[PDB]
């Protein structure tokens, strides 16, 4: 079962956990940190406050985003997938090229 | 040990394998251990928890030996 | 007595409490823990919010949806079954398909 | 002497205190609970919020319905008769039929 | 010196302190606590909110008001009068008839 | 050098600390407590807020006004004379007559 | 290098700690306190809330204003000058003639 | 890979911490401290806000630029070079001449 996020809100999967190469040729072994980055699976309609319609987000399906894992930050479980759902005012920037 | 979580991946590769598993850790408390009774008790899988022998150094000393004996890596 | 929820509220009742099988075919014991997903039963006219008239909600009745059990969720007690009512800015998302 | 409420506010009176009948035959004993359920008394004329007008309330004088014991909730003595006073925001949904 | 309220406030004065009678026949002496209910002095033009004029209120010179002795309520003292100064959201009712 | 207000803020100076004659011809000693009675100086244009202009204020220059000494109440000395600086919010009422 | 402000944003240079002097003739040793009193340095566009371009600000460079030493009070060091930026909001009042 | 904020938000480098040179010709050795300072890389499209388009921001990608280094404030690693991602809110003044 694929998802329907609720407007406003994006489903991403997180990436690697500390990618084992930060500062060249050293494998930073896990020194408990977690991972910021994640792409779009997903995304809704749009905000619907000030009422007129519906502004669409500025999110694709599969943008590479940096997110900040704040509180309205929720995990979920699909199809035994690791997956996150939060809103676009979680989303802070996109890695192109 | 104290939760599930970890155990689900290898328990995993056991559950579809057949055979039973030993699981000889530093300790094995919480849900974790209550969980792996009504996992066995069912037949889902054969699971048993035991501590380790020894103390302080002298037991990861020791915990080695045994996965040399059985061909294991201590985790 | 069938329930009448007041705009904005959505009525949903939890499905299966950790159902035992996560991980593939290991039957994870209760670990402390509670169901995110629901089915809804009744759904309000809309917001009210802005004056303007009332927008309806994005939610029919009789979809799979996740939720957040926040704070705005209530429990209460229909016929003797178990049911919730929280607003649509508690929910997050659907499952389709 | 009967109540006037002060737009937006709704004047209910509670029901049975745990009507002892719960999960079928058995007699749930006072198990330290309250009751849930009220009937409508008396009704504002609505909200001013947004300047524009005064928007009707959605409850008609009368109606069975289900709110949350939260903290706008007022409690008073009319007639030595026990009521309630809260807003339509505190109000989650009606039991027809 | 008669007081003039500064728009959107309310001038009254409280009643009786658990008038001895509660119940019926029964003479409550005093169990530790204040009235609710309270007369209108004075008024003011209406709240400024949303810039469009000023919205007069609801309350006219007289009537006998049920309200919340919440923060916003404040004491004051007039001639040597106990009176009390709240906005009119702070009031909830009226006792009419 | 005379002092002028930034819009919206009301310059007032205190009057007397418990007047001792409280309760008729009673001198009631310190007992620890201020003034809540002050004089206009100063008044600013007005609420900026809601865009659309600026609101003028509802007190002229020299109203005897009853105020809450809140957190909003700065205190200043100007030409050695102890002065007070809130806005309007914070003014309550006016004695007129 | 001068500075430059971003909209509704004020920089302002302290004035003199407790002048020595404060009652007339009496030198008022540091007594443990600061200065409210200010020279307006740069000023920004203005407010840019309620989307309607942006009103300017009521303070021209080179006023003598007080502040309120609030959190949004920030301090600052140009070409090794004492400096001090904070918004319009935090400004109080000016000192003329 | 160069970054691409999402609207409202700036990418900025810090400068450096507490250039030794504090106070003239003497060397402030690392006082346990941080730098203010930084230079702009990339700008979003600007706030959504108010429904209204978007309005874009005053910053242009390379401006030397004092912020505030508060919770909003976040810190990224590109390319292996060290980054912050804030909102403009965040930003207090530039840089100039």
Known sequence: ?97 | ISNIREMLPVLEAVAKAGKPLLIIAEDVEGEALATLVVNTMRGIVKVAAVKAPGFGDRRKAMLQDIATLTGGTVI
């Open chain 1, 1 to 97: 079962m694929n998802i329907r996020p609720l407007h406003d809100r994006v489903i991403v999967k997180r990436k690697e956990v500390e990618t084992k190469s930060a500062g060249g040729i050293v494998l930073t072994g896990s020194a408990a940190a977690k991972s910021t980055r994640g792409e779009v699976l997903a995304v809704g309609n749009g905000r619907i406050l000030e009422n007129g319609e519906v502004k669409p987000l500025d999110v694709k399906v599969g943008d590479i985003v940096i997110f900040n894992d704040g509180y309205g930050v929720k995990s979920e479980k699909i199809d035994n997938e690791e997956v996150l759902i939060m809103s676009e005012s979680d989303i802070l920037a996109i890695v192109e090229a």
